[PDB]
Amino acid sequence: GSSSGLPPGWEEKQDDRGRSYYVDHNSKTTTWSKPTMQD
């Protein structure tokens, strides 16, 4: 399904300043990576 959130296995959270890092459910890690589905 199309979905209305972050890419499958990914979720985006910003820091206290305002820069958004990604928490990857795929490998389970909070880091700066581009989604599995890069779009």
Sorted by sequence, the CB contacts under 8 Å of residue 22 that are 6+ apart come out as 6, 10, 11, 12, 13, 30, 31, 32, 33, 35
Structural domains in the chain, sorted by start: 1-39 (2.20.70.10)
Cα of first residue to Cα of last residue in the chain, in angstroms, is: 15
CA distance 9 to 13: 14
Q: Which stretch of DSSP H or E encloses residue 22?
A: strand 20-24
| Residue from 39, 29, 20 nearest 9 by CA | 29
Place of tokens 């499958």: 8
Within a 10 A sphere around the Cβ of 14, how many other Cβ atoms? Answer: 9
CA distance 32 to 3: 22
C-alpha 18 chain-centroid distance: 15
Q: Across the strands, what pairs with 20?
A: 14
